[PDB]
Amino acid sequence: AEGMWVPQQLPEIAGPLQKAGLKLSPEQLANLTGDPMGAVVALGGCTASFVSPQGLVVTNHHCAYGAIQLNSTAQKNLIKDGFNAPTLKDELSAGPNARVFVLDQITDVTAQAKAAIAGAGNDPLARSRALDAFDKAQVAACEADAGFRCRLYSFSGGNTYRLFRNMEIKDVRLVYAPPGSVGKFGGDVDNWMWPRHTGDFSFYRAYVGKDGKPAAFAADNVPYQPKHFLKFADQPLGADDFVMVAGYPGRTNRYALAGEFNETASFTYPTIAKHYNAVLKMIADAGKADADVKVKYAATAASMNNVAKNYLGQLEGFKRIDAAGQKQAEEAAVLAWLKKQGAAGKPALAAHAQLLKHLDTSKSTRERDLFVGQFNNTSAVGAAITLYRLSIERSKPDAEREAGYQERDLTTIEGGLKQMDRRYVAKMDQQLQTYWLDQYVALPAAQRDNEVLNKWLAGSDAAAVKSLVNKLGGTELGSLDTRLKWFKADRAAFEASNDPAIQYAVAVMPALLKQEEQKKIREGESLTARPLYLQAVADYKKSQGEFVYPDANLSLRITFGNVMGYGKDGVKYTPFTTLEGVAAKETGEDPFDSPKALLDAVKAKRYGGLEDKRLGSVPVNFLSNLDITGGNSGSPVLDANGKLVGLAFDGNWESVSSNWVFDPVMTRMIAVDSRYMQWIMQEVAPAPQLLKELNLA
Amino acid sequence: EGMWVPQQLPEIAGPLQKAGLKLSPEQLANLTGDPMGAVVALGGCTASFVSPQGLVVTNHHCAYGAIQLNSTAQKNLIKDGFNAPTLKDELSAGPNARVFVLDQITDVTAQAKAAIAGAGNDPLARSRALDAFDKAQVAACEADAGFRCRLYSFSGGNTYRLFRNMEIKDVRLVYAPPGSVGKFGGDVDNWMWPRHTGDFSFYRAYVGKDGKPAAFAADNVPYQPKHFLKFADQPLGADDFVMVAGYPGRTNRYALAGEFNETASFTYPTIAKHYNAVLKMIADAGKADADVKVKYAATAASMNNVAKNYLGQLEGFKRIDAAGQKQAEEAAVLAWLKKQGAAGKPALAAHAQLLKHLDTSKSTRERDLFVGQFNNTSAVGAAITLYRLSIERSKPDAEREAGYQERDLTTIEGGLKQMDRRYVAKMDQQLQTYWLDQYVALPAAQRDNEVLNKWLAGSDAAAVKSLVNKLGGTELGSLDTRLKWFKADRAAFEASNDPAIQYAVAVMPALLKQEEQKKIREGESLTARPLYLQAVADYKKSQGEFVYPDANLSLRITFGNVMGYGKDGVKYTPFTTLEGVAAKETGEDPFDSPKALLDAVKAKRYGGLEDKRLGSVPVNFLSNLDITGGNSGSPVLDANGKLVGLAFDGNWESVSSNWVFDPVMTRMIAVDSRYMQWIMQEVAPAPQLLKELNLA
Ligand SMILES: N[C@@H](CC1CCCCC1)C(=O)N[C@@H](Cc1ccc(O)cc1)C(=O)O
Ligand SMILES: N[C@@H](CC1CCCCC1)C(=O)N[C@@H](Cc1ccc(O)cc1)C(=O)O
């Protein structure tokens, strides 16, 4: 099924669900804090779910990569080796910014929100301020009670607003990670690819204080006791079987302008992919000189690889289906339907006009902005900026601070300063600074008009760069102790410091505030215009029959469909892989270097009671026609009776383009089978204490 | 599953009927009758006669040399089509192009064995005794003017057969599709399925007006074949019986375990690394000078094919544990022999003797490769070949080194003409530089080519640069200079101040002893190799395995069925279709189909060739046949002997079968006759050929 359906749409997908094979009633799914929906949880930009009454939480390996990285060293490398905690007291802190969000409540605030936007009238900046003050106020009242964190979501370009209330668990700990050769089998070669043979899973545990409320890490913290948790399935999952996912997809752009798509396709994806592949070459090369670099920058590298490869796959996805054409046609098809309507269609035409005008701004300045943006987001310069910004925002009363820099956000900023001690190496940061500076000075002279940066460079040669990196080399912000002091410090200490990173942060901060202000004016303009056009586009879509659901916005969504393969001229991809496919791809070298205990077990056909008689072996990964995207990683896959049969982690090569234009023929989710998870834990990287917790011993 | 010699038709009679063959088995034992007499050898490819006026069909990649010889940068036939509507338009395919038509096969085993035993004990004497026997049989068989003959060793030399062939020497190019069809997917799709490649082309064979073979004259008239193939009327579908007859070159399924271990660990990875380095050099020089791109097009393509093939076999080796299967079969044979008593002692001695041959070849292997490659650069290779030939002219004809006799002169002279369209001083110098950079990088112990270090005067980069400048002053770039030395004698070469010629004069005594040494080993292996392979075949038969000699450039027969293959997560289907070619489109090489094709497919112009079981027209198909190099261009015949396509490649998991056959995943890729027809109807038309073939 196409669709990232919101739970409020359960009425209209009820029939389709049952017809696909659901054997629960949809009313049981409509209880979002009941069984099974209430066990689905957000981590941030991943999904997860509870699977035990003592607060055990399962998700993807690549979602846990962060925490695993944080706790790794070059001597004791848990990314490579995996990890297991036989008792509570062995479990490792996932870090200060690890979160588990448990849904308390959703409420519609559409009428209020719109009334606040209307109360600002004409002026764009006011329209943006008013929405911002509405958000803050709704969030303050919702978060009055301790241990809740609330968020406001814009749907359908602003036609709908809903407020989510979550309990925010702040003490999360690692319990189990398989070896990297299992969790990340096939690495960057197999990424976005079927056939796939990857054991992408890991386990956390949620803790709270003795008193029951979320607390930061503490030795006397205790396991959280969830209302609801999923059970592993006792019914073997075969081809054509019903499946569904619930989760927190991030962003889709299916209702975007043909122009937005065109700027993305011909500038952003090729540019980013190109430069990422350069930076990655540089990190790999440094990482062989010193294995501390390899480990401290491994989360950055994994994430950049994923993005760069994704972008190359979307470009090609666009040729496969000519998305420039379809966008053009559907866009002109709508502008026509509106032309027909009895004077009531004229306001949406005016909206289209405004939205067009947004796109042209950057043609000459867009390489520059990337390069400057990326330099300002290297570690020491980025810390310096964050810190200096906060000191200004601390001037103001709390209600008027920028989102990001309120009281309720201090915890998180402070956690980031801490986390960077595990992700920072001076000699590597200097190479990154050098790289993006080298790309700025290589611009045409006309496009190199960042005045602060031109002053600090005093020229456009390679020697200007070298000399500025040497000067930025005298910063103290590579010390945690220093960072934590600056975290407390007054705006005036920043303005009077000779630390070079700080000096630079102070020099750039006026332009940064001005860029930020223009952005808010654009948001302000489109806050009556996007919702108008997106309603028209949707009414037109409902005209031709067809499915209408909102673009993803980090909120909870349901997708459903069936286990099934897909086809290309000469090829039919079957819906399952098995143990033998894993062995068959053995090269004895990264990324195909499975543990020996795996190769042994497969050679001896030690299936441990998990084989599917229809396949002849234990299945590994599987395909289905569910609609997911970034953020859906780690989402639980449920069978017709709401038991866990796999985790979502990826899609196939053809699916990546469907962020923009969905293709029902060749769009597929890749999930890891609950049977492979259990197999690995029995026969390869044993977790006996954990197989007992999940009642599988 | 096997590369069966015609003499083995008895055994496979049952399997052939079982597989779906309608013809009788003994229709096929008729090698000059039907439909086998239609199958021809091109040298190192296969083809077939398909019209009573001497039309021949092969792969575009086999014809690629002819097309390239006939191409310039201004007029590139590779990129563009070629069609010849009348006889007078058909281009010469080059002096060295041939068609061999089989006359006769007689078994001469006992004479051959007699001849080597006759020399008794000395190894070098055994080498010469069989060189002498080969020549005698050849010169008597080749005595009638039209004919060419070859002696084949089978099964390590347990069998010897003589092949008699009518030698057609005027071959002309009739039709080539554009390169974006005949080589669709270039190096990305090479060795891969699913495949979408229109790999075919047409030659015409000519004789003089006597009916006798003659070199290119405009007086010559098309040969009239006794037998030719008809295109199928019956549509080919999945499960249908298919067979191929052709000339597979070499297989190594009967290699010793150490032979394999060294190919896998050294030869293939080394050659793959160095060929890729050189390919990038050539592609870069090619982008600079369009002249270089065209003249070196056959080299690049050949080097790419080899390079990707070697990468493929190494992955096969790990996918089937080749190393462990070879070891297991060797150990099992060695043990089956240890208690045959006296029936097994001879074979064990022979194994031991073969292992020494391998130990000697290890010591020198890295130098042998770089010096070999250097000595086969165009100018140096010429100098060596020409000088060697004048040395050989001194001697009477029967006493000359095979390849340097009267019969071989026409070939040698052809090579020097063909090199004209395949040589550019500045590229040859980059190739000379490359192989020399690899020699001087060797550790000092292994840089023991006396002559070459003398000519180097150092071993840094700028001593290489100085030697290549010194060789810059040669005139062997000019055709008429090469042709002059083709005529001259020993004394002139020894008198020459041409750098390359002095070089060849200097190296020739080393080369001659290195070659004397080779013949001593060849002499040792003439009794060992047959003994040991007789043991392996003995053991294999007791286990009831399929038993058949390694390919040796002779005519062979293979059979099976139209079917795909599976992998974990994937079920490959037997055919591709027109829409598959349109879907791979980029508009940039090598996925840049001609506009005519995109349009014909976009508007569903199936020219009445659609097969219903697919929504459109077939492009390529798969089947479980046993092919290897030389089987390219081989006709693929349906169960009733008609033609349904040409063999042109294998899938990725197949290439490893050179050394260890995997039946589950070894498949042939062929181009379907309907795609051929479809192309000459709706894309780059050839109505004149549709007429000649009874498809209009
Ligand atoms: N491709 C994954 C990233 C990992 C794959 C396993 C090896 C290590 C890297 C990814 O980005 N997944 C997304 C989920 C997703 C699924 C399907 C589609 O079309 C798009 C995204 C995520 O992490 O949220
Ligand atoms: N891969 C082909 C040559 C390609 C040249 C570029 C254009 C497309 C074809 C090849 O090497 N074919 C072999 C035959 C062969 C078939 C099957 C197996 O397993 C091995 C070899 C040939 O040229 O004879």
Sequence spans of domains, chain B = 6-98+169-252+550-692, 257-538
Q: A41 CA distance to ligand 2 centroid (A)?
A: 54
Contacts for A120-127: CB closer than 8 Å, 24+ residues apart: A123/A524, A124/A521, A124/A522, A124/A524, A124/A525, A125/A517, A125/A520, A125/A521, A125/A524, A126/A524, A127/A524, A127/A525, A127/A527, A127/A528
User: Which residue of chain B comes nearest to A588, CA vs CA?
Assistant: B318
Resolution (A): 2.6
Nearest ligand (C-alpha, residue B631) = 2
**C-alpha dihedral (A626, A630, A634, A637), degrees to nearest 10:** -10
Q: From the alpha carbon of B649, which atom of ligand 2 is closest?
A: 16
Q: For residue B318, what are its two tokens?
A: 């790990």
CA distance B475 to B382: 11
**Cα gap B204→B594, rounded to integer Å:** 26
Chain B partners within 8 Å of A195 (Cβ): 567-570
Can you tell me which residue has the tokens 């191929």? Answer: B244
**Which residue type occupies B581?**
V
Distance B251 CA to ligand 2 centre (A): 14
Q: Which two tokens stand for residue A94?
A: 């996932």
Cα B10 to averaged position of ligand 2 atoms, centre (Å): 30
* Angstroms from A63 CA to nearest CA on chain B: 25
- The answer, yes or no, to whether any atom of ligand 1 lies below 6 A from the CB of A66, is no
Which of the 8 DSSP states describes residue B495? T
**CB of B173 closer than 8 Å to CB of B203:** yes
Check CB contact under 8 Å for B569 and A576: yes
Instruction: For residue A221, give both structure tokens.
Output: 């913290």
**Atom of ligand 1 at shortest range from CA of A184:** 7
Q: Please identify which of the residues B189, B199, B626, B649 carries the catalytic annotation.
A: B199
Q: Which of B189, B314, B568 is the mutation pick for testing A, counting most A CBs within 10 A?
A: B568
A570 Cβ neighbours under 8 A, 6+ residues apart: B193, B194, B195, B572, B573, B575, B576, B580
Nearest residue on chain A to B587, alpha-carbon basis: A319
Q: Are B551 and B250 in contact (CB under 8 A)?
A: yes
Cα distance between residue B98 and residue B409, in whole Å: 15
Min Cα separation A542/chain B (Å):
31
Residue B297 near ligand 2, beta carbon < 6 Å: no
Helix, strand, or coil here: B51? strand
Residue found under tokens 């979502």:
A648
**Distance (Å, rounded) from C-alpha A372 to C-alpha A440?**
7
Q: In this structure, what token pair is assigned to residue A100?
A: 């588990």
Residue B57 phi/psi, 5-degree rounding, is -120, 135
Cis peptide before A510 (omega within 30 of 0): no
Match 């009313």 to its residue by tokens: A27
What residue owns the CA closest to ligand 2's atom 13? Answer: B629
Nearest to B505 by CA among B674, B364, B391, B352: B391
Cβ-based interface (< 8 Å): residues of B facing A: 193-196, 315, 318-319, 566-573, 575-577, 579-580, 583, 586
Q: Which of B593, B632, B634, B673 is catalytic?
A: B632
> Between B569, B577, B579, which is nearest A195 by CB?
B569
Whole-angstrom Cα distance, residue B198 to residue B201?
9
Nearest CA in chain B to A322: B583
Question: In chain B, which residue's Cα lies nearest the Cα of A316?
Answer: B586
Structure tokens at A328: 């053009």
Which token pair is A112? 């209020």
**How does strand B566-567 pair with strand A40-42?**
unpaired
Task: Compute the distance between CA of residue B397 and CA of residue A130 in angstroms, rounded to an integer.
Answer: 104
Report the residue among B181, B244, B649, B652 best suited for mutation to probe ligand 2: largest number of ligand atoms under 8 A from its CB.
B649
Interchain contact, B194 vs A580, CB within 8 Å: no
Does residue B500 sit in helix, strand or coil? Answer: helix
Number of H helices, E strands in chain A: 27, 20
Helix (H, G, I), strand (E, B) or coil at B343: coil
Is residue B152 within 8 Å of B553, Cβ to Cβ?
yes
CA–CA distance, A88 with A162 (Å, rounded to integer): 38
Rg of chain A (C-alpha set)? 26
Tell me the C-alpha distance between B319 and B313, whole Å: 10
Chain A: closest CA distance from residue B9 (Å)? 34
User: What is the CATH architecture of B6-98+169-252+550-692?
Assistant: Beta Barrel (2.40)
Distances in whole angstroms, Cα of residue A347 to Cα of each of A33, A114, A344, A532, A548: 41, 17, 7, 8, 21
Neighbours of A123 (CB within 10 A): 12
> B686: which residues sit within 8 A by CB, 6+ positions away?
B83, B175, B202, B680
- The pair of structure tokens assigned to B441 is 């990088």
Provide, as residue numbers in chain A, all residues whose Cβ is less than 8 Å from the Cβ of B194: 568-571
- What length is written for chain A? 697
Distance from CA of A4 to the nearest CA of B (A): 27
CA distance B659 to chain A (A): 19
Query: Of A670, A646, A10, nearest to A18 (Cα)?
Result: A10
Chain B residues whose CB is inside 8 A of the A584 CB are 319, 567-568
CB-CB contact of A379 with A436 (8 Å): no
Helices A124-142 and A110-118: crossing angle in degrees, nearest 10, is 140
Task: Please say whether the beta carbons of A254 and A247 come within 8 A.
Answer: no
| Torsion from C-alpha of B285, B286, B288, B290, nearest 10 degrees | 140
B137 C-beta neighbours (distance < 10 Å), count: 20
Q: Can B289 be counted among the known catalytic residues?
A: no
Distance B228 CA to ligand 2 centre (A): 24
**The pair of three-digit structure tokens given for residue A562, joined into one six-digit string:** 């069936």
In this structure, the residue with its CA closest to atom 13 of ligand 1 is A630
Give catalytic residues of A, as residue numbers: 62, 200, 633
> CA–CA separation, A335 vs A352, rounded Å?
9
Q: Is A181 in the pocket of ligand 1 (CB under 6 A)?
A: no
CA B374, distance to chain mean position in Å, is: 22
CA distance A617 to A612: 6
- What is the C-alpha separation between A638 and B623, in angstroms, rounded? 41
Contact B568 A577 (CB under 8 A): yes
Partner residue facing A572 (CB), from B193, B318, B571: B571
| Coil/strand/helix, residue B599 | helix
Which residue in B318, B571, B575 is closest to A574 by CB distance? B571
Determine the distance separating the centroid of ligand 2 and the alpha carbon of B629, expressed in angstroms. 6
**Are B296 and B421 in contact, with CB atoms under 8 Å apart?**
no
Chain A positions touching B567 (Cβ under 8 A) are 195, 581, 584
Q: Are B154 and B5 in contact (CB under 8 A)?
A: yes
Is the CB of residue B631 below 6 angstroms from any atom belonging to ligand 2? yes
Tell how far CA B83 is from the center of its chain. 26
* Alpha helical stretches, state H, B543-588: 578-583
- Collapsing DSSP to helix, strand or coil, B347 comes out as helix
Residues in Cβ contact with A332 at an 8 Å cutoff, skipping those fewer than 6 apart: none
What residues of chain A have any CB closer than 8 angstroms to a CB in chain B? 194-197, 319-320, 568-574, 576-578, 580-582, 584, 586-588
Cβ distance A195 to B567 less than 8 Å, yes or no, reads yes
Please name the residues in contact with A683: beta carbons below 8 A apart, sequence gap of 6 or more.
A597, A598, A601, A606, A608
Q: Which residues of A touch B319 (CB under 8 A)?
A: 584
Contacts of B193 in chain A (CB under 8 A): 570
Q: Left if phi > 0, otherwise alpha if psi is -120 to 50, otherwise beta: which for A620?
A: alpha
How many angstroms separate the CA of residue A57 from the nearest CA in chain B? 30
Beta-carbon separation of A570 and B570 below 8 A: no
Measured between alpha carbons, how far is A669 from A627 in angstroms, rounded to an integer? 7
DSSP SS3 for A394: coil
Tell which atom from ligand 2 comes closest to the C-alpha of B666.
19
Contact A583, A593 (CB under 8 A): no
Would you call B632 a catalytic residue per the annotation? Answer: yes
CATH tag, A7-99+170-253+551-693: 2.40.10.120
Side-chain-side CA neighbours of residue A662 (13 Å): 21
Interface probe for B, chosen from A198, A321, A569 (most Cβ of B below 10 Å), is A569
Residue B180 to residue B80: CA distance in whole angstroms: 9
Shortest CA distance from A583: residue in chain B: B319
Instruction: Report the chain B residue with the minimal C-alpha distance to residue A581.
Output: B568
User: Which ligand minimizes its atom distance to the CA of A202?
Assistant: 1
User: What span, in angstroms and rounded, lies between the C-alpha atoms of A171 and A294?
Assistant: 27
